[PDB]
RNA sequence: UUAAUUCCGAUAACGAACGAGACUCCUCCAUGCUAACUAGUUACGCGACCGGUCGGCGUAACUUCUUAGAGGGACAAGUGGCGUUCAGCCACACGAGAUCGAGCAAUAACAGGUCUGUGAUGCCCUUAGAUGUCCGGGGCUGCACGCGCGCUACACUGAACGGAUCAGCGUGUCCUGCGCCGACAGGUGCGGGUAACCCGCUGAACCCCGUUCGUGAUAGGGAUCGGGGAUUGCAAUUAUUUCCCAUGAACGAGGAAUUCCCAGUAAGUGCGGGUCAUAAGCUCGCGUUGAUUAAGUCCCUGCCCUUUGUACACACCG
């Protein structure tokens, strides 16, 4: 529902998404309630920094984990 | 000393060209994991990681591919590497050594040294393919 | 050099007529190259049975089998010979 | 060692001594990819030889959209594995055979023109991929959740027994319907 | 051009034919879509250099393509809304225009049979880029 | 009442107004005593074992 | 018992005929023959690139791949079990296969279809102000509606954008390749092919790999309309088709009912042929991807047979 992050949303997603079992664009949409295309994006930029890992990238199913 | 086997999906045809060498297996110039469907490509590995690298690290092979789809392809390649490496076994290596390869390929996956008739039927008038009707 | 092209509707007379033809020059000692055997060619023609619509969809499948073969050297009813250079 | 690529085929137990031999995963059923076309439609008691890793991606083909996209579904339950070693950190394989043992309808009732009847060994896991693939499949139809997310929690969820499992509410809506009915 | 992975050396190869700033890039780069049975333009900007390194690498591997060759080659599904999806050829002025751009670059021949070729000189771009991409994975 | 567990030994025939039923005669597993008919759903052939939750009536 | 009045067996019947089967064309192999500059492989030289690639060029070996002739091969043959230990069935080993797909198809029937397929045809009718025949224009496309075959959808198992990568059937005097022009649809010059030669290594689509889109009537769906560019033809208005821009409707898996289908099958996906000056949402074929369930039953619905009844025999439309 969520397009752009708010300082309430965008503090929720760096201090307990990098401590979920299961790190996806479409899990963290649902309960952040934020559009697919910006926990896309978001889940990215944790990447490029070190706070989450990559299980295994394709098209349509991106699976993140964390440390 | 090489021999020329061919393997044969619905309609692929894919010949392996096993020659003495070193561990070399391409398709069509392109290295065995390089072909583009990745999905598939461990059915193309299944003659070298059931047979292990070391028997293969004395031929070399270079599979050439044409007819059919993706999918019978892979079936065609696999079959085709499974085959020349039999068939150089028993040219030029003891027949010993020959069902000590064929029971390890037949043990897992019949479809590697057989290859199974199965065909497209024709289609018959009053339906929009062979058994379904209108 | 001359290329005899051989083209029938039945295979019997074709390679009838095809195996005089390498034999009776054969003996002539002349060096003959074997019968390349084309690709045979079926006319496909489905037609629907019946003379109006009231037909079950029913098809008719014809077909008319062309075989050519060809024999490069240095006749029976039914089969076509043409020789080139 | 023969494995999927980085999930072993040993260690997968099965509990129930009846479907034990109508799944087919360890030492002898083991590829590297659910994958291999064997013809397993051509006698009665073929299909049981078949790996249910191959028979959970053959069922997931139904739709007159996914008919004859077989390398989607491989990629679906390479994927679903992923995320079930992701979420539990037992073994994918451990997880789909249990899914099949808490899935499967161990009686039925028949229609009469009702009569609570037994039901085959391989019906059970005939019916408990059937409704596995089915509740993954609705789960995915109109929602942002992948269908490897779908697939990885209808199978954790019946592998566990958590009544929020489609096959489970599916699968314990038939006994009790043959246990008023018997 | 072979050795590697396909996908990736287009990227890359036109990644060096974007940092070699001699490619013609047409005015109507920015309007045209690339076939008659695309819906929009291609989303990437710099699509031109996309297709260059693309169409430089069919005629590694068959050469005497020609303008009709790889507008078969780039062609795919035209959705004819509610009747069936045929095969539709790709754009004609994009891949002649795109051939001519390579043989700017002195890459791309005309074949003495049929088209074009490739070149010795672009035989050995092709090779260099192909050795990156190989160190580089 | 527990979850017996028997094997097939013997099909029948098949029963039901469409033949969706087999008559299987089914005996237990822990003692060759209690060789009871039973009706299975599916495809059934000598050898399978069959997870009877009830095992009183025969039917 | 069998797909089968297929067989065994019972036996006032015995021996046979048509149909079934056999047969014909098909695909499954046969590194064994016969041969291939209109098919290829391999070894070679040649040469471009950094021993690997080359459908990049050349004529000596010979047939694996390709083509197609001949001859082989499979017959419930072998094993186990079930059976009048018969006819056969089931399960296995071996093996390219252990019910492959058409064609052909008896006796006999329909008041089944077709006079609009015929210079097949009886009769009737119209015969020159014609129901002959030609040329114009219109219609068969007309639309409150009630149905029957279909296509496209209702998406994230997805639309798009881009990358990569694979067919077969077949057609060609029209099929089409290259160099130019254009955004596309087009145009234009030079060419090839009456064809395993050219199109053509048929670079098909789905699919695969990236990239954005994120319950959303939405980047799902592209129906309905506007404004223009072209092509076909003597001529498109009632838009022949085609392209571009814009317009963005119903449709969130569908009531009672009902259809098709058992393995390379259903379904998805595209191609070719027929129609064709212009030409596929149809149909006949083709390959591609490729399952779920079932190896069973008279429950329903269809026919068949036996028995039974008949005042029916133009045969219950009696």
């Given at each position: ?13 760096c ?14 949409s649902?309960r ?7 926990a ?14 990559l ?5 349509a ?7 | 000393?090489s ?8 309609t ?6 096993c ?6 297996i ?12 990745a ?6 590995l299944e003659?070298?990681?059931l ?6 690290a004395?031929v ?21 590497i ?14 010993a ?6 029971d ?25 393919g ?5 | ?14 390679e009838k007529?095809?195996?005089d ?24 023609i489905?037609?629907?049975?019946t ?16 075989h ?18 | ?5 980085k999930?072993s ?7 129930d ?12 059923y083991?590829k ?19 790996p ?5 991606t ?18 679906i ?15 994918p ?7 099949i ?10 229609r ?55 096959a ?15 | ?30 309007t ?9 333009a ?9 297709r ?31 009747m069936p ?10 891949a ?7 043989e ?34 | ?24 005669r ?7 005593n ?6 299975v ?11 009877l939750?009830?095992?009183?009536r025969?039917?």
């Amino acid at each position: 529902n969520l397009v752009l992050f708010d300082k309430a949303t965008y503090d929720k997603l760096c201090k307990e998404v990098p401590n979920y079992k299961l790190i996806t664009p479409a899990v963290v949409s649902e309960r952040l309630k934020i559009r697919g295309s910006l926990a896309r994006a978001a889940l990215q930029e944790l990447l490029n920094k070190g706070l989450i890992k990559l299980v295994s990238k394709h098209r349509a199913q991106v699976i993140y984990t964390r440390n | 000393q090489s021999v020329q086997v061919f393997g044969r999906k619905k309609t692929a045809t894919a010949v392996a060209h096993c020659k003495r060498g070193n561990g070399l297996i391409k398709v069509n110039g392109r290295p065995l994991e390089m072909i583009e469907p990745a999905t598939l490509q461990y059915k193309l590995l299944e003659p070298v990681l059931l047979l292990g690298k070391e028997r293969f690290a004395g031929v070399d092979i270079r599979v050439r591919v044409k007819g059919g789809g993706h999918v019978a392809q892979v079936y065609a390649i696999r079959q085709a590497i499974s085959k020349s490496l039999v068939a150089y076994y028993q040219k030029y290596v003891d027949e010993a050594s020959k069902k000590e390869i064929k029971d390890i390929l037949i043990q897992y996956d019949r479809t590697l040294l057989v290859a199974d008739p199965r065909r497209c039927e024709s289609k018959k008038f009053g339906g929009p393919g062979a058994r379904a009707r209108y | 050099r001359i290329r005899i092209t051989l083209t029938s509707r039945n295979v019997k007379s074709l390679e009838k007529v095809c195996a005089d033809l390498i034999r009776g020059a054969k003996e002539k000692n002349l060096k003959v190259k074997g019968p390349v055997r084309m690709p045979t060619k079926t006319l496909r023609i489905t037609t629907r049975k019946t003379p109006c619509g009231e037909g079950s969809k029913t098809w008719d499948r014809f077909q008319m089998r062309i075989h050519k073969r060809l024999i490069d050297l240095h006749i029976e009813p039914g089969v076509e010979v043409e020789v080139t250079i | 060692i023969k494995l999927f690529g980085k999930w072993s085929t040993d260690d997968v137990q099965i509990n129930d001594i009846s479907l034990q031999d109508y799944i087919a995963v360890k030492e002898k059923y083991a590829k590297f990819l659910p994958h291999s076309g064997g013809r397993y439609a051509a006698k009665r008691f073929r299909k049981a030889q078949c790996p249910i890793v191959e028979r959970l991606t053959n069922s997931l083909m139904m739709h007159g959209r996914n008919n004859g996209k077989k390398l989607m579904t491989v990629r679906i339950v390479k994927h679903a594995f992923e995320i079930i070693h992701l979420l539990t950190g037992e073994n994918p394989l451990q997880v789909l055979v249990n899914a099949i043992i808490n899935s499967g309808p161990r009686e039925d009732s028949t229609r009469i023109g009702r009569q609570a009847v037994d039901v085959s060994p391989l019906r059970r896991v005939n019916q408990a991929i059937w409704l596995l693939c089915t509740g993954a499949r609705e789960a995915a139809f109109r929602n942002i959740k992948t269908i490897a997310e779908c697939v990885a929690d209808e199978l954790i969820n019946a592998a566990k027994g958590s009544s929020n499992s489609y096959a489970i509410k599916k699968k314990d809506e038939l006994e009790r319907v043959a246990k008023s009915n018997r | 051009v072979k050795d590697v992975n396909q996908q990736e050396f287009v990227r890359a190869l036109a990644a060096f034919l974007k940092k070699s700033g001699k490619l013609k890039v047409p005015e109507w780069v920015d309007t045209v879509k690339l076939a008659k049975h695309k819906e929009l333009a291609p989303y990437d900007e710099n699509w031109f250099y996309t297709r260059a390194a693309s169409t430089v690498r069919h005629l590694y591997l068959r050469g005497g393509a020609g303008v009709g060759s790889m507008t078969k080659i780039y062609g795919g599904r035209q959705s004819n809304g509610v009747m069936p999806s045929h095969f539709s050829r790709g754009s004609k002025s994009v891949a002649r225009k795109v051939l001519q751009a390579l043989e700017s670059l002195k890459m791309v021949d005309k074949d003495p049979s049929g088209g074009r070729k490739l070149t010795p000189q672009g035989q050995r771009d092709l090779d260099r880029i192909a050795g990156q991409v190989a160190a580089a994975s | 009442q527990p979850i017996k567990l028997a094997r097939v030994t013997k099909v029948l025939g098949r029963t039901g107004s469409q033949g969706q039923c087999t008559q299987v005669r089914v005996e237990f597993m822990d003692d060759s005593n209690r060789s009871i008919i039973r009706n299975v759903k599916g495809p059934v052939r000598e050898g399978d074992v069959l997870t009877l939750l009830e095992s009183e009536r025969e039917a």
